[PDB]
PDB file of all heavy atoms in Angstrom:
ATOM      1  N   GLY A 356     -98.003  19.556 -98.387  1.00 35.40           N
ATOM      2  CA  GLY A 356     -98.512  20.698 -99.163  1.00 35.40           C
ATOM      3  C   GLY A 356     -99.878  20.428 -99.800  1.00 35.40           C
ATOM      4  O   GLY A 356    -100.056  20.591-101.015  1.00 35.40           O
ATOM      5  N   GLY A 357    -100.855  20.012 -98.967  1.00 37.13           N
ATOM      6  CA  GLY A 357    -102.254  19.843 -99.394  1.00 37.13           C
ATOM      7  C   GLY A 357    -103.102  21.029 -98.927  1.00 37.13           C
ATOM      8  O   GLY A 357    -102.978  21.457 -97.775  1.00 37.13           O
ATOM      9  N   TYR A 358    -103.966  21.567 -99.800  1.00 38.34           N
ATOM     10  CA  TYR A 358    -104.680  22.842 -99.536  1.00 38.34           C
ATOM     11  C   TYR A 358    -106.193  22.625 -99.347  1.00 38.34           C
ATOM     12  O   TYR A 358    -106.835  21.973-100.156  1.00 38.34           O
ATOM     13  CB  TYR A 358    -104.433  23.839-100.697  1.00 38.34           C
ATOM     14  CG  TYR A 358    -102.956  24.219-100.873  1.00 38.34           C
ATOM     15  CD1 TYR A 358    -102.103  23.466-101.691  1.00 38.34           C
ATOM     16  CD2 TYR A 358    -102.409  25.313-100.198  1.00 38.34           C
ATOM     17  CE1 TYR A 358    -100.768  23.793-101.824  1.00 38.34           C
ATOM     18  CE2 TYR A 358    -101.078  25.635-100.329  1.00 38.34           C
ATOM     19  CZ  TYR A 358    -100.263  24.874-101.142  1.00 38.34           C
ATOM     20  OH  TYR A 358     -98.931  25.191-101.253  1.00 38.34           O
ATOM     21  N   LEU A 359    -106.738  23.158 -98.245  1.00 36.06           N
ATOM     22  CA  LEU A 359    -108.197  23.280 -98.030  1.00 36.06           C
ATOM     23  C   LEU A 359    -108.551  24.780 -98.044  1.00 36.06           C
ATOM     24  O   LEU A 359    -108.059  25.537 -97.204  1.00 36.06           O
ATOM     25  CB  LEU A 359    -108.653  22.638 -96.677  1.00 36.06           C
ATOM     26  CG  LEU A 359    -108.509  21.082 -96.527  1.00 36.06           C
ATOM     27  CD1 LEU A 359    -107.039  20.629 -96.410  1.00 36.06           C
ATOM     28  CD2 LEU A 359    -109.337  20.567 -95.329  1.00 36.06           C
ATOM     29  N   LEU A 360    -109.383  25.224 -98.997  1.00 36.81           N
ATOM     30  CA  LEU A 360    -109.744  26.651 -99.119  1.00 36.81           C
ATOM     31  C   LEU A 360    -111.165  26.885 -98.560  1.00 36.81           C
ATOM     32  O   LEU A 360    -112.156  26.453 -99.151  1.00 36.81           O
ATOM     33  CB  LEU A 360    -109.641  27.112-100.605  1.00 36.81           C
ATOM     34  CG  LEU A 360    -109.759  28.653-100.835  1.00 36.81           C
ATOM     35  CD1 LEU A 360    -108.677  29.413-100.051  1.00 36.81           C
ATOM     36  CD2 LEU A 360    -109.724  29.011-102.344  1.00 36.81           C
ATOM     37  N   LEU A 361    -111.240  27.573 -97.404  1.00 35.79           N
ATOM     38  CA  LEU A 361    -112.510  27.869 -96.698  1.00 35.79           C
ATOM     39  C   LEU A 361    -113.015  29.287 -97.058  1.00 35.79           C
ATOM     40  O   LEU A 361    -112.243  30.247 -97.066  1.00 35.79           O
ATOM     41  CB  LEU A 361    -112.336  27.713 -95.147  1.00 35.79           C
ATOM     42  CG  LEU A 361    -112.355  26.248 -94.573  1.00 35.79           C
ATOM     43  CD1 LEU A 361    -111.223  25.365 -95.149  1.00 35.79           C
ATOM     44  CD2 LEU A 361    -112.319  26.256 -93.022  1.00 35.79           C
ATOM     45  N   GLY A 362    -114.322  29.396 -97.357  1.00 35.39           N
ATOM     46  CA  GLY A 362    -114.948  30.669 -97.776  1.00 35.39           C
ATOM     47  C   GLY A 362    -115.195  30.720 -99.284  1.00 35.39           C
ATOM     48  O   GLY A 362    -115.209  31.798 -99.898  1.00 35.39           O
ATOM     49  N   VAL A 363    -115.396  29.533 -99.875  1.00 37.37           N
ATOM     50  CA  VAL A 363    -115.674  29.359-101.320  1.00 37.37           C
ATOM     51  C   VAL A 363    -117.121  28.882-101.530  1.00 37.37           C
ATOM     52  O   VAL A 363    -117.613  28.032-100.792  1.00 37.37           O
ATOM     53  CB  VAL A 363    -114.704  28.289-101.960  1.00 37.37           C
ATOM     54  CG1 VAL A 363    -114.940  28.114-103.488  1.00 37.37           C
ATOM     55  CG2 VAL A 363    -113.238  28.647-101.678  1.00 37.37           C
ATOM     56  N   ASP A 364    -117.781  29.443-102.545  1.00 34.86           N
ATOM     57  CA  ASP A 364    -119.093  28.979-103.020  1.00 34.86           C
ATOM     58  C   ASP A 364    -118.923  28.483-104.473  1.00 34.86           C
ATOM     59  O   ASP A 364    -117.895  28.743-105.103  1.00 34.86           O
ATOM     60  CB  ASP A 364    -120.124  30.134-102.928  1.00 34.86           C
ATOM     61  CG  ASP A 364    -121.577  29.654-103.036  1.00 34.86           C
ATOM     62  OD1 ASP A 364    -122.098  29.525-104.161  1.00 34.86           O
ATOM     63  OD2 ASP A 364    -122.198  29.376-101.986  1.00 34.86           O
ATOM     64  N   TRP A 365    -119.913  27.752-104.995  1.00 33.56           N
ATOM     65  CA  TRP A 365    -119.868  27.234-106.374  1.00 33.56           C
ATOM     66  C   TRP A 365    -121.277  27.140-106.989  1.00 33.56           C
ATOM     67  O   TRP A 365    -122.250  26.773-106.318  1.00 33.56           O
ATOM     68  CB  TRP A 365    -119.090  25.885-106.447  1.00 33.56           C
ATOM     69  CG  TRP A 365    -119.428  24.879-105.359  1.00 33.56           C
ATOM     70  CD1 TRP A 365    -120.449  23.964-105.352  1.00 33.56           C
ATOM     71  CD2 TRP A 365    -118.718  24.688-104.122  1.00 33.56           C
ATOM     72  NE1 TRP A 365    -120.413  23.232-104.192  1.00 33.56           N
ATOM     73  CE2 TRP A 365    -119.363  23.656-103.423  1.00 33.56           C
ATOM     74  CE3 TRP A 365    -117.600  25.299-103.535  1.00 33.56           C
ATOM     75  CZ2 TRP A 365    -118.925  23.209-102.178  1.00 33.56           C
ATOM     76  CZ3 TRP A 365    -117.169  24.860-102.300  1.00 33.56           C
ATOM     77  CH2 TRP A 365    -117.829  23.822-101.634  1.00 33.56           C
ATOM     78  N   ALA A 366    -121.356  27.468-108.288  1.00 33.48           N
ATOM     79  CA  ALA A 366    -122.617  27.591-109.037  1.00 33.48           C
ATOM     80  C   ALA A 366    -122.687  26.534-110.155  1.00 33.48           C
ATOM     81  O   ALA A 366    -121.701  26.312-110.870  1.00 33.48           O
ATOM     82  CB  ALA A 366    -122.715  29.009-109.624  1.00 33.48           C
ATOM     83  N   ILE A 367    -123.855  25.878-110.295  1.00 34.93           N
ATOM     84  CA  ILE A 367    -124.049  24.782-111.265  1.00 34.93           C
ATOM     85  C   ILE A 367    -124.769  25.277-112.544  1.00 34.93           C
ATOM     86  O   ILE A 367    -125.913  25.746-112.495  1.00 34.93           O
ATOM     87  CB  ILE A 367    -124.835  23.575-110.629  1.00 34.93           C
ATOM     88  CG1 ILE A 367    -124.101  23.048-109.351  1.00 34.93           C
ATOM     89  CG2 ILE A 367    -125.048  22.430-111.656  1.00 34.93           C
ATOM     90  CD1 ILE A 367    -122.674  22.553-109.577  1.00 34.93           C
ATOM     91  N   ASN A 368    -124.072  25.151-113.682  1.00 33.90           N
ATOM     92  CA  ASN A 368    -124.612  25.491-115.023  1.00 33.90           C
ATOM     93  C   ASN A 368    -125.593  24.403-115.532  1.00 33.90           C
ATOM     94  O   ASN A 368    -125.716  23.339-114.923  1.00 33.90           O
ATOM     95  CB  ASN A 368    -123.443  25.671-116.026  1.00 33.90           C
ATOM     96  CG  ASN A 368    -122.465  26.782-115.635  1.00 33.90           C
ATOM     97  OD1 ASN A 368    -122.835  27.770-115.007  1.00 33.90           O
ATOM     98  ND2 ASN A 368    -121.216  26.637-116.021  1.00 33.90           N
ATOM     99  N   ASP A 369    -126.275  24.671-116.667  1.00 34.77           N
ATOM    100  CA  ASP A 369    -127.216  23.700-117.299  1.00 34.77           C
ATOM    101  C   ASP A 369    -126.484  22.432-117.823  1.00 34.77           C
ATOM    102  O   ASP A 369    -127.097  21.379-118.002  1.00 34.77           O
ATOM    103  CB  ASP A 369    -127.991  24.379-118.451  1.00 34.77           C
ATOM    104  CG  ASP A 369    -128.732  25.646-117.995  1.00 34.77           C
ATOM    105  OD1 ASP A 369    -129.772  25.524-117.312  1.00 34.77           O
ATOM    106  OD2 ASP A 369    -128.273  26.771-118.297  1.00 34.77           O
ATOM    107  N   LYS A 370    -125.167  22.563-118.053  1.00 33.46           N
ATOM    108  CA  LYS A 370    -124.268  21.439-118.421  1.00 33.46           C
ATOM    109  C   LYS A 370    -124.010  20.475-117.223  1.00 33.46           C
ATOM    110  O   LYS A 370    -123.525  19.353-117.413  1.00 33.46           O
ATOM    111  CB  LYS A 370    -122.910  22.021-118.907  1.00 33.46           C
ATOM    112  CG  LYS A 370    -123.016  22.998-120.098  1.00 33.46           C
ATOM    113  CD  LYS A 370    -121.664  23.657-120.493  1.00 33.46           C
ATOM    114  CE  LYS A 370    -120.681  22.709-121.226  1.00 33.46           C
ATOM    115  NZ  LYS A 370    -120.143  21.615-120.374  1.00 33.46           N
ATOM    116  N   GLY A 371    -124.357  20.925-115.999  1.00 33.23           N
ATOM    117  CA  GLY A 371    -123.952  20.247-114.757  1.00 33.23           C
ATOM    118  C   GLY A 371    -122.517  20.614-114.364  1.00 33.23           C
ATOM    119  O   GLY A 371    -121.769  19.780-113.843  1.00 33.23           O
ATOM    120  N   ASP A 372    -122.140  21.879-114.639  1.00 30.68           N
ATOM    121  CA  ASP A 372    -120.753  22.379-114.497  1.00 30.68           C
ATOM    122  C   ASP A 372    -120.568  23.165-113.177  1.00 30.68           C
ATOM    123  O   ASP A 372    -121.434  23.945-112.801  1.00 30.68           O
ATOM    124  CB  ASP A 372    -120.415  23.272-115.719  1.00 30.68           C
ATOM    125  CG  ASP A 372    -118.966  23.786-115.735  1.00 30.68           C
ATOM    126  OD1 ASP A 372    -118.044  22.983-115.466  1.00 30.68           O
ATOM    127  OD2 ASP A 372    -118.748  24.983-116.033  1.00 30.68           O
ATOM    128  N   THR A 373    -119.414  22.976-112.511  1.00 31.91           N
ATOM    129  CA  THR A 373    -119.131  23.573-111.181  1.00 31.91           C
ATOM    130  C   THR A 373    -118.131  24.747-111.311  1.00 31.91           C
ATOM    131  O   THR A 373    -116.938  24.540-111.559  1.00 31.91           O
ATOM    132  CB  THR A 373    -118.568  22.490-110.189  1.00 31.91           C
ATOM    133  OG1 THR A 373    -119.428  21.336-110.189  1.00 31.91           O
ATOM    134  CG2 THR A 373    -118.447  23.021-108.745  1.00 31.91           C
ATOM    135  N   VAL A 374    -118.640  25.981-111.149  1.00 34.97           N
ATOM    136  CA  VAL A 374    -117.833  27.222-111.223  1.00 34.97           C
ATOM    137  C   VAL A 374    -117.578  27.767-109.795  1.00 34.97           C
ATOM    138  O   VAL A 374    -118.524  28.119-109.093  1.00 34.97           O
ATOM    139  CB  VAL A 374    -118.568  28.316-112.091  1.00 34.97           C
ATOM    140  CG1 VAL A 374    -117.730  29.619-112.212  1.00 34.97           C
ATOM    141  CG2 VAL A 374    -118.947  27.759-113.491  1.00 34.97           C
ATOM    142  N   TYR A 375    -116.297  27.885-109.395  1.00 33.00           N
ATOM    143  CA  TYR A 375    -115.909  28.267-108.014  1.00 33.00           C
ATOM    144  C   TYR A 375    -115.708  29.797-107.914  1.00 33.00           C
ATOM    145  O   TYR A 375    -114.863  30.380-108.607  1.00 33.00           O
ATOM    146  CB  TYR A 375    -114.615  27.529-107.578  1.00 33.00           C
ATOM    147  CG  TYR A 375    -114.749  25.997-107.529  1.00 33.00           C
ATOM    148  CD1 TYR A 375    -114.461  25.203-108.646  1.00 33.00           C
ATOM    149  CD2 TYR A 375    -115.173  25.348-106.367  1.00 33.00           C
ATOM    150  CE1 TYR A 375    -114.585  23.825-108.597  1.00 33.00           C
ATOM    151  CE2 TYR A 375    -115.299  23.972-106.318  1.00 33.00           C
ATOM    152  CZ  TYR A 375    -115.005  23.215-107.432  1.00 33.00           C
ATOM    153  OH  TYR A 375    -115.136  21.842-107.382  1.00 33.00           O
ATOM    154  N   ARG A 376    -116.513  30.430-107.047  1.00 31.58           N
ATOM    155  CA  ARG A 376    -116.534  31.895-106.839  1.00 31.58           C
ATOM    156  C   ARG A 376    -116.235  32.248-105.355  1.00 31.58           C
ATOM    157  O   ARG A 376    -116.500  31.434-104.464  1.00 31.58           O
ATOM    158  CB  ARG A 376    -117.926  32.452-107.257  1.00 31.58           C
ATOM    159  CG  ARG A 376    -118.340  32.111-108.707  1.00 31.58           C
ATOM    160  CD  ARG A 376    -119.580  32.894-109.174  1.00 31.58           C
ATOM    161  NE  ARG A 376    -119.335  34.352-109.172  1.00 31.58           N
ATOM    162  CZ  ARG A 376    -120.171  35.275-109.588  1.00 31.58           C
ATOM    163  NH1 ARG A 376    -121.336  34.973-110.060  1.00 31.58           N
ATOM    164  NH2 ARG A 376    -119.826  36.513-109.531  1.00 31.58           N
ATOM    165  N   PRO A 377    -115.677  33.472-105.057  1.00 29.60           N
ATOM    166  CA  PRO A 377    -115.405  33.895-103.668  1.00 29.60           C
ATOM    167  C   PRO A 377    -116.662  34.482-102.960  1.00 29.60           C
ATOM    168  O   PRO A 377    -117.463  35.207-103.563  1.00 29.60           O
ATOM    169  CB  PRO A 377    -114.296  34.952-103.852  1.00 29.60           C
ATOM    170  CG  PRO A 377    -114.608  35.601-105.171  1.00 29.60           C
ATOM    171  CD  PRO A 377    -115.265  34.527-106.032  1.00 29.60           C
ATOM    172  N   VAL A 378    -116.803  34.156-101.669  1.00 27.62           N
ATOM    173  CA  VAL A 378    -117.892  34.679-100.795  1.00 27.62           C
ATOM    174  C   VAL A 378    -117.337  35.075 -99.414  1.00 27.62           C
ATOM    175  O   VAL A 378    -117.888  35.952 -98.740  1.00 27.62           O
ATOM    176  CB  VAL A 378    -119.096  33.671-100.625  1.00 27.62           C
ATOM    177  CG1 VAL A 378    -119.937  33.576-101.926  1.00 27.62           C
ATOM    178  CG2 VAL A 378    -118.604  32.270-100.163  1.00 27.62           C
ATOM    179  N   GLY A 379    -116.235  34.426 -99.016  1.00 27.96           N
ATOM    180  CA  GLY A 379    -115.536  34.749 -97.777  1.00 27.96           C
ATOM    181  C   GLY A 379    -116.147  34.131 -96.518  1.00 27.96           C
ATOM    182  O   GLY A 379    -117.126  33.374 -96.570  1.00 27.96           O
ATOM    183  N   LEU A 380    -115.528  34.458 -95.382  1.00 29.11           N
ATOM    184  CA  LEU A 380    -115.914  33.965 -94.049  1.00 29.11           C
ATOM    185  C   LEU A 380    -116.725  35.041 -93.273  1.00 29.11           C
ATOM    186  O   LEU A 380    -116.408  36.233 -93.379  1.00 29.11           O
ATOM    187  CB  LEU A 380    -114.616  33.590 -93.285  1.00 29.11           C
ATOM    188  CG  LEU A 380    -113.730  32.491 -93.972  1.00 29.11           C
ATOM    189  CD1 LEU A 380    -112.332  32.408 -93.318  1.00 29.11           C
ATOM    190  CD2 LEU A 380    -114.443  31.113 -93.959  1.00 29.11           C
ATOM    191  N   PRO A 381    -117.783  34.643 -92.471  1.00 25.75           N
ATOM    192  CA  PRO A 381    -118.588  35.605 -91.652  1.00 25.75           C
ATOM    193  C   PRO A 381    -117.738  36.301 -90.551  1.00 25.75           C
ATOM    194  O   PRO A 381    -118.034  37.429 -90.142  1.00 25.75           O
ATOM    195  CB  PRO A 381    -119.702  34.712 -91.036  1.00 25.75           C
ATOM    196  CG  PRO A 381    -119.122  33.328 -91.042  1.00 25.75           C
ATOM    197  CD  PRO A 381    -118.288  33.250 -92.305  1.00 25.75           C
ATOM    198  N   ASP A 382    -116.684  35.604 -90.092  1.00 25.05           N
ATOM    199  CA  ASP A 382    -115.661  36.167 -89.195  1.00 25.05           C
ATOM    200  C   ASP A 382    -114.296  35.519 -89.565  1.00 25.05           C
ATOM    201  O   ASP A 382    -114.024  34.388 -89.142  1.00 25.05           O
ATOM    202  CB  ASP A 382    -116.023  35.929 -87.702  1.00 25.05           C
ATOM    203  CG  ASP A 382    -115.217  36.824 -86.731  1.00 25.05           C
ATOM    204  OD1 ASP A 382    -113.975  36.707 -86.676  1.00 25.05           O
ATOM    205  OD2 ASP A 382    -115.829  37.642 -86.006  1.00 25.05           O
ATOM    206  N   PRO A 383    -113.448  36.216 -90.394  1.00 20.65           N
ATOM    207  CA  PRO A 383    -112.155  35.672 -90.918  1.00 20.65           C
ATOM    208  C   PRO A 383    -111.223  35.065 -89.838  1.00 20.65           C
ATOM    209  O   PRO A 383    -110.766  33.915 -89.961  1.00 20.65           O
ATOM    210  CB  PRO A 383    -111.498  36.916 -91.563  1.00 20.65           C
ATOM    211  CG  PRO A 383    -112.647  37.781 -91.972  1.00 20.65           C
ATOM    212  CD  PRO A 383    -113.691  37.597 -90.899  1.00 20.65           C
ATOM    213  N   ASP A 384    -110.979  35.857 -88.777  1.00 20.95           N
ATOM    214  CA  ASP A 384    -110.069  35.490 -87.678  1.00 20.95           C
ATOM    215  C   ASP A 384    -110.613  34.260 -86.911  1.00 20.95           C
ATOM    216  O   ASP A 384    -109.913  33.262 -86.761  1.00 20.95           O
ATOM    217  CB  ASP A 384    -109.879  36.709 -86.731  1.00 20.95           C
ATOM    218  CG  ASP A 384    -109.073  36.380 -85.457  1.00 20.95           C
ATOM    219  OD1 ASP A 384    -107.835  36.209 -85.542  1.00 20.95           O
ATOM    220  OD2 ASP A 384    -109.673  36.282 -84.362  1.00 20.95           O
ATOM    221  N   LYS A 385    -111.891  34.339 -86.494  1.00 24.39           N
ATOM    222  CA  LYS A 385    -112.536  33.323 -85.626  1.00 24.39           C
ATOM    223  C   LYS A 385    -112.553  31.909 -86.264  1.00 24.39           C
ATOM    224  O   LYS A 385    -112.367  30.925 -85.568  1.00 24.39           O
ATOM    225  CB  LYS A 385    -113.966  33.778 -85.254  1.00 24.39           C
ATOM    226  CG  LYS A 385    -114.664  32.953 -84.155  1.00 24.39           C
ATOM    227  CD  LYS A 385    -116.010  33.565 -83.672  1.00 24.39           C
ATOM    228  CE  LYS A 385    -115.847  34.854 -82.828  1.00 24.39           C
ATOM    229  NZ  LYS A 385    -115.361  36.026 -83.605  1.00 24.39           N
TER     230      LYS A 385
END
């Protein structure tokens, strides 16, 4: 039960902080 989540982006704050946001896949099925 180990998870790899594909279609994720992340933004770096002035603290050096990693915030994970959705962007999705260019072709979900493929």
Side-chain angles (χ1 to χ4, degrees):
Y358 298 89
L359 294 71
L360 190 58
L361 281 61
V363 182
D364 196 273
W365 45 86
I367 303 300
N368 300 330
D369 304 286
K370 303 175 74 292
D372 184 45
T373 309
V374 181
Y375 298 90
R376 304 191 62 176
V378 288
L380 301 167
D382 196 297
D384 173 74
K385 191 172 289 69

